[PDB]
Amino acid sequence: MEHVAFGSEDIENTLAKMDDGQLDGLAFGAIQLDGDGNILQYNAAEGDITGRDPKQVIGKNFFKDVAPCTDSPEFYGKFKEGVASGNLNTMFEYTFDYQMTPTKVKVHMKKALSGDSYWVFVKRV
Numbered sequence: 189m190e191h192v193a194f195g196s197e198d199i200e201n202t203l204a205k206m207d208d209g210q211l212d213g214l215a216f217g218a219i220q221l222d223g224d225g226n227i228l229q230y231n232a233a234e235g236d237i238t239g240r241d242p243k244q245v246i247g248k249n250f251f252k253d254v255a256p257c258t259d260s261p262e263f264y265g266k267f268k269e270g271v272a273s274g275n276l277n278t279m280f281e282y283t284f285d286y287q288m289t290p291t292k293v294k295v296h297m298k299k300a301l302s303g304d305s306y307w308v309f310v311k312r313v
């Protein structure tokens with residue numbers, strides 16, 4: 189395992205050192221998005237939660253293509269305000285229900301330490 193707790197205050201500094209292989213050792217799902225919502229990184233734990241194959245969703249748009257259930261003011265709306273503002277740090281519960289059994293999760297969205305990238309972290313509840 190990589191030992192990093194979900195919700196940790198300095199998580200963006202810790203994850204700045206990991207490559208795709210290290211990200212697969214986290215105890216929670218991790219997605220890195222660009223400012224348009226395209227998927228740059230997608231770890232093994234996220235694929236275990238949602239059924240998606242990580243290598244197949246990299247490059248797709250999360251809000252348009254992969255996760256239309258998140259295209260709502262409650263999820264995408266928060267993301268886009270964060271990108272526009274250049275700051276984002278929010279945690280909320282959500283249900284993922286597209287082409288899968290409805291699954292309740294906790295989501296943490298946080299701006300990355302690098303400029304135009306954003307993390308989405310997911311764990312079951």
Ligand SMILES: *C(=O)/C=C/c1ccc(O)cc1
Binds near residue numbers: 240
């Ligand atoms: C709603 O459409 C949610 C879909 C979804 C969430 C998270 C993922 O990693 C993949 C699909």
